[PDB]
């Protein structure tokens, strides 16, 4: 676990209501990694502004770029030692599973030297769809890790569990 | 057939010249269902304004949301008892077949509890492409229904045929 | 080779730094074909303006349309005798391989009567990703041609090689 | 406590990083009150969009109005049985303590028939300023309730404590 | 009363539904003063356009300035012999009572050589709030005049009463 | 005096014609402090652009933020060792005296660990108003310093006097 | 010197940091001339707003016109008895010296009946450039006056010196 | 004269009140040349819209380009057999005389294979300025023709005279 | 040649089709200098975006400034040890030759301590114009270097030749 203290973590945020709570993960991970940055999708930004998310991490890469210049997928892909997408949408799973990259989050997956760990989150109806399962499987077959969501009173596993999943994957 | 009189129908409209005539289907289906709403893709709206389509149905969900707020896929997906996409583009077929959802129409497919019935419509050159056929097949294997288009002096089957196809699928 | 002098060539440009140099190919191909036009993706235009690219070819079809009217994929797809996408992104490969068409470049592939020849270009990390290779293969299995990039002091083969690849494919 | 199940609760959100987590309070209070609505200040909206906050309550009144029409302070002030401002800024405390109302949140305080319960939240440096304390006192002397923040590893008391404070004040 | 025929009157209009009827006062005062001008707050303008109010007086100073240049508080403050704010909001009372000036109306109070006469108007709930009364008192202690509103089938006293109140104050 | 050479100075500029000459103070103070930054109010910026003021200091914090993100009051408040507002408006005096903070300048006063030194500047009519004097007094009672303006052929004391006043206050 | 008390003075302001202090000259000249107006270049306005400069003179002619109508060079050129450009940029010197007039300031020089007096101000590197000297000379040969800048702890001569230079030139 | 019936004429219009009457020349020249097009400067367009001028000639090239693409100076310069600038401003004379080209009109002069004939028009004060005369001379020395303006109850010579001047120059 | 490895190079890009290929020079010069930055004219940016050019150098100064603030000519002029304009337009030659500076590129020439080396590029018709030659000569007489263009199957000399020309001039 102490091995991460000197690693660069990139968190890709996708469109989900649970993204609004991303600070819980972000603040918890702050003490375990060397540096943490974020890359968001358009839907994620509409839910929670990139400027808001910047109060909980070192830098936020927006799909809209900075001053009209699109951020570099190869630069952020190489910059990061670990790329974790949380939360991941059915869409992002479908795009990455099939080599499609219509936004920076999906593009970065292809440009990151290592495999990507996904933390899916979606409506139960969506979660039980054949394609999603097929997509998840395909990603695994391809080498990516897919932390399953947990049922609750479905959702993401608490920051601590998530941290452990990140550490385990980094092998 | 009289079983539908008490069902909620959601029609997803995609980018096609034939969308301009969607009122023919919409007005014909009005007497057979409890309520009919529409969800459109951006290209469909550029061809025929959502406000225009609203004169032929109960409500139109736009990709652009309402007052800047994106409409809910889980809400419209659950709201509807039957989700029928007419006309369906090669694009929508390719997205749904592979679990990709870059617009509300494709997302709703994943968020609807039941399977979706598709009414493809495209250029003959496009229709004969290997991928399209593979995509259509994959959708069927996945459980979705795909009403084939008919050749004419290719296109969609008249409102009456279409209605029958909807009724048959609802089993 | 002299057979091309009377053929219409459509070049689809995708998002890559190498697109900035597209005039080298465009000007070189000018003497071998009857007429050459271009169709670009949004990212390609942000890198090199459609108006700039218009100084090196007969016409440039933008994703943004002309006067707010989207250009026709069936019209440009049929207009062209040969459709060559250079440079091709992982994204375009992933979209075309799976029958997804979210931009004019990918849509045109489905609307062109013949198969399309692709000239991929991307970061080496991206090039070695499993999905890309799978996508490339799938395109070949589907009938499309995929000119591989070459390593250099990876990139596109010079205009002359490329021309030859176009001629060979036209059979 | 069961007396609240039939009361209308209005929550005024002000500019604070802690506003991003307002769903925790909002969702927790949902089962104890008849209906819950929100009224926000401009700074609060820049941090967390009104549309986001609308996924956790019945309605959100923005400073920007609805379709260009400013929402009514007398209407929302009278509509609500209980008006609770959480989180409250030094600014809102200073405005309300002195009868100044430059935004809907502060105006509503004057237009609500009953007294308002405040849940201050600010930087410790700000919290120890003479004026703030004087303002807090003045509000109390005026009849308003001011739930003090708690020190932690200062902040707002958990949703449950807060609920209790609301119930106690409603007397 | 005939002493006013040669005095310059400045009327500050604040945000209130009763501002819509300001012409009644404005037209009635036209024959008793040398010249009458108006200065409005943003809320007042949203209710009744400055251009509308200009049909009932000699000039209207807007918070938005003229051609992007903010109007001068010292110039309008000195220009006027009598400065009367009707209708006055709880907000304006709170700002002036405490030396705060966030808009031209409140700023002018500080820049006018003489004391200002206020004609408050607000919701009864607001009128009975402790702070308002304290603010009104403070203004009086400071030297300003505050014409109380009258109950009706609360509101402003008719133009004629108001005129008398202006004359009495001018001593 | 040489004690300041290693202190961080923050200058808050408010809306006054005298702000146009702020470079005289800014350039004079440059050799006595470790670093000097500025924070402006909206009115100050309309008079003299933040970009202009940036040619005479190390950084200028605008009310409008940077790239749409509001600057941090706690960050700039803590960053600075000494916070001096010159020129200070009646408005800023009224806001700070009463714990109201509707702009960054006033907010920073509450977020700065130490007391703030004010250099008021306004029209003589405004200066002789009861509220202003009461506000000035209240600020002093609260611990803030208020350098009075001087009459001239009223205004701010020359840069040199001002520097001395800063040094004296820093005790 | 008393001869000027009845003359119209037009001051053209160009792009220079020293323009920010133009009020020193403007206010000093106010008592010696019948009336003083200003005409600015775009760069000068970006440094110090035309509305700001209007507080120190009778009228400011902007390059942007008034309500979209370009101000008249012949009207302002004829209106003025004396046209003095302070500060003058290398650019304005180069334009006027060569009969080029791309902005109102340079155009007015050609439209003014009399010769123009220039008060150059620029970086020392720029001042020592061959072209500038040649341009200055050419202007003199043409009849215009060019008050040289003075070295200091280069810059413009104080308002008083400048006034004298204006008086001397008016012969 | 009949030699022109088969020549392409390009008329460059500059900023002058007399440009408003350009149709008189344009319509008169229509029967003597093969084709007539126009190229305008920004000031000319503000006086008389390019669309207006298009009712009196075959095509109008605007400084603003067409659909955001700047028109080609080499294309229009080569297209035309004769390039005549009427009316010509002091500015255009100064730019062309010195090899400066900040707008399409001046640039075209350099890109036209042949010499350009100018029809100056300006205020008499401007016309008597040394630089203008020097500029006119320089243009002649360079090979360009400069039809002098005539005094009237100064202005341009009637369309007929102008036509003759064009014919004479074409040798 | 190895003397340059520790020098700062500023490249000014002007409006020319050949600017699109500027990366060839930029990338080639990267290994010979300490650092390379670019300053562009408006026309150059319309042809090839500043963000594009930023992928081939350390920084790009735009005429439009950064965040609305114009970049400093004295700062970039002094920053650079060598200032080379490639490609140079007839316009830039005409402006610099005559001491006119209407854009940052031309202004920087005057603000750079040393002489500037120009690499002209234009249409042959333009190149043979008397004024251009006169302008080129004048620049030389003034001390600037002007690398002539070469005829080809006219244009700029390859990056390697250009590098040599830079080295030779640096003496
Ligand atoms: C409140 C809410 C909660 C949701 N929660 C989930 C969830 O938990 N799980 C799930 O699988 N789906 C969820 N969705 C749906 C999901 O957002 C959609 O399927 C979406 O199409 C894909 O989201 P994304 O984040 O993967 O990609 P995105 O890239 O954000 O794509 C979606 C939208 O982005 C726009 N877009 C992309 N790039 C740009 C650009 N450069 N400029 C302008 N627009 C651009 C598209 O036009 C489209 O409308 C939610 C939607 C909403 C509105
Ligand atoms: C007149 C016309 C008729 C056509 N008929 C057919 C047909 O019969 N069959 C067929 O298969 N194809 C047809 N097409 C092509 C099809 O529209 C394209 O393949 C398109 O890319 C996909 O269309 P869609 O409706 O599936 O999806 P869409 O979601 O409409 O995607 C297409 C366009 O939507 C834009 N877009 C998506 N979300 C947003 C957003 N939030 N904001 C802004 N833009 C957004 C994209 O940028 C893109 O240009 C037609 C095109 C035109 C112009
Ligand atoms: C400088 C640079 C160089 C790159 N080089 C490569 C490379 O060599 N190889 C590679 O595989 N990838 C490369 N990429 C990444 C690639 O651009 C991304 O994966 C992109 O998402 C897909 O590009 P595209 O050209 O295939 O499609 P695009 O259709 O251009 O999709 C990408 C962007 O287009 C927007 N978009 C689509 N339609 C519209 C519309 N109608 N209106 C507004 N926005 C629209 C999307 O919202 C999205 O941000 C590069 C990116 C940058 C910034
Ligand atoms: C990330 C962040 C966190 C903060 N956390 C705290 C905190 O915990 N506690 C605290 O006391 N302060 C906090 N502040 C500071 C506080 O936001 C400021 O003092 C602010 O001036 C007052 O906030 P408000 O919510 O009370 O009022 P607001 O009404 O939001 O006033 C602040 C801003 O609103 C603008 N505004 C008001 N009405 C409109 C309108 N109709 N249109 C456009 N703009 C309008 C103003 O111009 C001003 O910039 C924070 C600021 C930031 C940027
Ligand atoms: C229909 C209606 C009727 C009302 N009637 C009363 C009443 O009778 N009595 C009463 O006490 N209150 C009344 N109010 C409420 C009162 O308008 C609010 O308290 C308001 O915040 C203060 O109003 P004002 O006129 O004093 O000041 P204002 O200066 O108008 O302040 C209110 C609004 O002005 C905006 N604002 C200020 N300056 C600018 C600027 N330069 N640019 C853009 N926005 C600016 C603020 O952001 C804020 O939303 C009413 C509100 C409405 C909508
Ligand atoms: C040329 C001139 C000189 C002046 N000189 C003095 C003087 O010497 N002394 C004095 O006491 N008063 C002076 N005033 C008046 C003073 O500017 C007003 O009282 C003002 O309301 C308060 O100024 P401020 O700088 O304290 O605050 P500000 O915060 O600048 O408040 C004033 C204006 O700011 C706007 N504003 C605030 N935040 C935002 C935002 N985020 N977006 C958009 N608008 C916003 C308001 O709507 C309002 O119009 C002057 C006014 C002018 C026009
Ligand atoms: C902070 C600063 C200080 C400077 N100080 C000096 C100095 O002391 N001496 C000196 O010689 N140079 C100085 N310069 C440089 C000088 O501003 C430039 O050479 C400039 O190109 C010419 O300035 P001008 O005032 O003569 O003309 P301007 O007419 O202001 O020309 C410069 C800018 O004006 C724009 N412009 C002109 N008309 C319009 C219009 N109608 N609409 C939109 N834009 C228009 C141009 O596009 C160009 O960017 C300074 C620049 C800056 C940024
Ligand atoms: C009603 C009127 C009549 C006039 N009559 C004459 C006359 O008879 N003779 C004479 O010599 N002068 C005359 N002038 C003055 C002349 O217009 C000015 O000297 C002007 O600066 C040069 O005009 P132009 O047509 O040569 O060039 P222009 O290129 O039109 O230059 C002038 C204006 O163009 C703007 N401009 C240039 N390119 C662009 C662009 N791409 N986008 C936006 N703005 C741009 C500049 O910023 C500047 O304000 C007149 C001016 C007016 C207002
Ligand atoms: C595709 C193309 C290729 C060309 N190739 C050459 C060539 O090889 N050689 C040659 O000598 N000429 C060439 N030209 C012509 C040259 O661009 C024109 O003479 C131009 O007027 C001067 O270009 P510049 O780069 O020197 O200056 P620029 O400063 O770019 O001046 C030209 C344009 O800039 C605008 N402008 C300047 N500052 C601003 C500002 N702040 N905001 C908005 N607009 C501003 C003007 O209004 C004007 O339209 C070409 C033109 C085009 C369209």
For chain A, the straight-line distance linking the first and the last C-alpha, in angstroms and rounded, comes to 11
Please enumerate in sequence order all residues whose Cβ is within 8 A of that of D40, keeping only pairs 6 or more positions apart, or say none: D12, D13, D14, D50, D53, D60, D61, D62, D63, D105
Q: D143 - beta bridge partners?
A: none
Using CA positions, which residue lies closest to atom 43 of ligand 9?
I42
CB G76 within 8 A of CB G108: yes
Report how many Cβ contacts below 8 Å link chain D to chain E.
Answer: 55
CB G102 within 8 A of CB H91: yes
Q: Which residues of C touch B129 (CB under 8 A)?
A: 99, 110
Q: F118 - beta bridge partners?
A: F85, F146
Q: What's the token pair of residue F159?
A: 């840069």
Helix (H, G, I), strand (E, B), or coil: what is residue I58?
coil
Least Cα distance to D79 among D11, D159, D170, D23 occurs for D11
Least Cα distance to I169 among I87, I84, I109 occurs for I84
Q: Give whole-number Cα distances, B166 to B27, B31, C149, F7, in Å.
A: 15, 14, 48, 77
Phi, psi of C19 (to 5 degrees): -70, -25
Strands B117-120 and I82-88: unpaired
Q: Which ligand has an atom closest to residue D126 CA?
A: 4
CB I160 within 8 A of CB I26: no
Q: E59 - beta bridge partners?
A: E37
CB B5 within 8 A of CB B33: yes
Q: C39 - beta bridge partners?
A: C12, C61
Helix (H, G, I), strand (E, B), or coil: what is residue C53?
helix
Give CB contacts under 8 A, 24+ apart, made by G39-42. Answer: G39/G10, G39/G11, G39/G12, G39/G13, G39/G71, G39/G76, G39/G104, G39/G105, G39/G108, G40/G12, G40/G13, G40/G14, G40/G105, G41/G12, G41/G13, G41/G14, G41/G15, G41/G89, G41/G92, G41/G103, G41/G104, G41/G105, G42/G15, G42/G103
Distance CA F99, CA D92 (A): 9
CB contact under 8 A, F23 and G21: yes
Strands D145-146 and D117-120: parallel
**Residue B96: CB within 6 Å of ligand 2?**
no
CB D55 within 8 A of CB D30: no
Q: Helix E104-111 crosses helix F90-97 at what angle (to 10 degrees)?
A: 100
Dihedral over Cα of H55, H56, H59, H62: its sign:
negative
Q: Which ligand has an atom closest to residue A120 CA?
A: 1
Which residue's entry shows tokens 């999603």? A132
Residue F28 burial (C-beta neighbours within 10 Å; 0-12, 13-18, 19+): middle
Report how many Cβ contacts below 8 Å link chain A to chain C.
Answer: 55
Distance CA C13, CA C39 (A): 6
Experimental method: X-ray
Half-sphere exposure of I37 (CA within 13 A, CB side): 19
Distance CA B79, CA B36 (A): 11
Q: H145 - beta bridge partners?
A: H117
- DSSP annotation of E147 reads P
CATH code of the domain occupying H1-171 = 3.40.50.1950
Strands G145-146 and C82-88: unpaired
Domain boundaries, chain E: 1-171
The residues of A annotated with a catalytic role in the active site are: 73
Least Cα distance to E82 among E53, E112, E104 occurs for E112
Lay out the sheet containing A117-120: strands in order across.
A59-61, A35-40, A8-13, A82-88, A117-120, A145-146
**Residue E85: CB within 6 Å of ligand 5?**
no
Least Cα distance to A62 among A6, A2, A13 occurs for A13
**Residue I74: CB within 6 Å of ligand 7?**
no
If contacts are CB pairs under 8 Å, which of residues 140-159 in chain G contact chain H?
142-143
- DSSP annotation of G47 reads H
Q: Which residues of F touch A54 (CB under 8 A)?
A: 69
Using CA positions, which residue lies closest to atom 1 of ligand 7?
G17
**Ramachandran quadrant class, E65 (left: phi over 0; alpha: psi -120 to 50; beta: rest):** left
Helix (H, G, I), strand (E, B), or coil: what is residue I110?
helix
Q: What's the token pair of residue D63?
A: 């400073």
Atom of ligand 7 nearest to the CA of G18: 8
**Residue G100: CB within 6 Å of ligand 7?**
no
Q: What's the token pair of residue I2?
A: 């190895």
Q: What b/e readout covers F103-139, taking b as 16+ CB neighbours within 10 angstroms? A: bbbbbbbbbbeebbbbbbbbbebbbebebbebbbebb
Phi, psi of D118 (to 5 degrees): -105, 140
H152 vs chain I: nearest CA distance in angstroms?
34
Least Cα distance to F90 among E96, E105, E99 occurs for E99
Atom of ligand 3 nearest to the CA of C15: 25
Data resolution in angstroms: 2.5
Helix (H, G, I), strand (E, B), or coil: what is residue H73?
helix
Atom of ligand 1 nearest to the CA of A47: 1
The number of residues in chain H equals 171
Half-sphere exposure of G154 (CA within 13 A, CB side): 16
CA dihedral C47, C49, C55, C56 (to 10 degrees): 40
Q: Note the Cα E50 to chain centre separation in Å.
A: 15
Chain breaks in chain I following residues, C–N > 2.5 Å: 153
Number of Cβ within a 10 Å radius of residue G123? 20
Percent helix / strand / coil, chain C, rounded to 5: 45, 20, 35
Catalytic one of F73, F112, F114, F144 = F73
Q: With an 8 Å Cβ cutoff, is A31 touching chain I?
A: no
Q: Note the Cα H135 to chain centre separation in Å.
A: 16
Q: What's the token pair of residue C39?
A: 């169709």
Phi, psi of F71 (to 5 degrees): -65, 155
Distance CA D56, CA D54 (A): 5
Interface probe, candidates H131, H136, H154, chain G, greatest G C-beta count within 10 A = H131
Number of Cβ within a 10 Å radius of residue I25? 25
Using CA positions, which residue lies closest to atom 15 of ligand 5?
E15
Please enumerate in sequence order all residues whose Cβ is within 8 A of that of E112, keeping only pairs 6 or more positions apart, or say none: E10, E77, E78, E80, E83, F125
CB G26 within 8 A of CB G57: yes
**Residue I71: CB within 6 Å of ligand 7?**
no
What value, to the nearest 5°, has the Cα angle with vertex D155 and ends D144 and F81? 105
Q: Note the Cα A67 to chain centre separation in Å.
A: 24
**Ligand 5 centre distance from Cα of residue F94 (Å):** 19
Q: What's the token pair of residue A25?
A: 């993960």
Distance CA G104, CA G96 (A): 11
Number of Cβ within a 10 Å radius of residue H5? 10
Kindly state the helix (H) or strand (E) to which residue B35 belongs, with its residue range.
strand B35-40
Distance CA E89, CA E77 (A): 20
I52 vs chain A: nearest CA distance in angstroms?
9
What value, to the nearest 5°, has the Cα angle with vertex I93 and ends I89 and I98? 150
Q: What's the token pair of residue B152?
A: 């004419």
Please enumerate in sequence order all residues whose Cβ is within 8 A of that of B147, keeping only pairs 6 or more positions apart, or say none: B117, B118, B119, B120, B157, B162, B165
Q: Helix I130-142 crosses helix I90-97 at what angle (to 10 degrees)?
A: 50
Least Cα distance to F72 among A31, D43, A21, D135 occurs for D43
Dihedral over Cα of I86, I89, I94, I100: its sign:
negative
**Residue B43: CB within 6 Å of ligand 2?**
yes
**Ligand 8 centre distance from Cα of residue I43 (Å):** 19
Q: Give whole-number Cα distances, A54 to A60, E18, G84, in Å.
A: 6, 45, 52
């Amino acid at each position: 676990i102490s091995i991460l203290k000197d690693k660069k973590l990139l968190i890709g945020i996708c469109g989900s209501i649970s993204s609004v709570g991303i600070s819980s993960y972000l603040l918890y991970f702050k003490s375990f990694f060397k540096e943490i940055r974020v890359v968001m999708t358009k839907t994620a930004e509409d839910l929670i502004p990139a400027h808001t998310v910047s109060y909980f991490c070192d830098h936020v890469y927006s799909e809209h770029g900075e001053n009209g210049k699109r951020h570099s997928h190869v630069e952020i892909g190489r910059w990061a030692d670990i790329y974790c997408i949380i939360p991941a949408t059915a869409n992002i799973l479908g795009q990455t599973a099939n080599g499609v990259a219509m936004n920076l989050v999906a593009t970065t997956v292809l440009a990151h030297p290592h495999n990507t760990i996904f933390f899916p989150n979606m409506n139960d109806l969506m979660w039980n769809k054949t394609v999603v399962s097929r997509n998840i499987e395909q990603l695994r077959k391809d080498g990516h890790i897919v932390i399953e969501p947990v049922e609750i009173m479905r959702g993401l596993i608490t920051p601590d569990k998530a941290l452990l999943a990140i550490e385990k994957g980094f092998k």
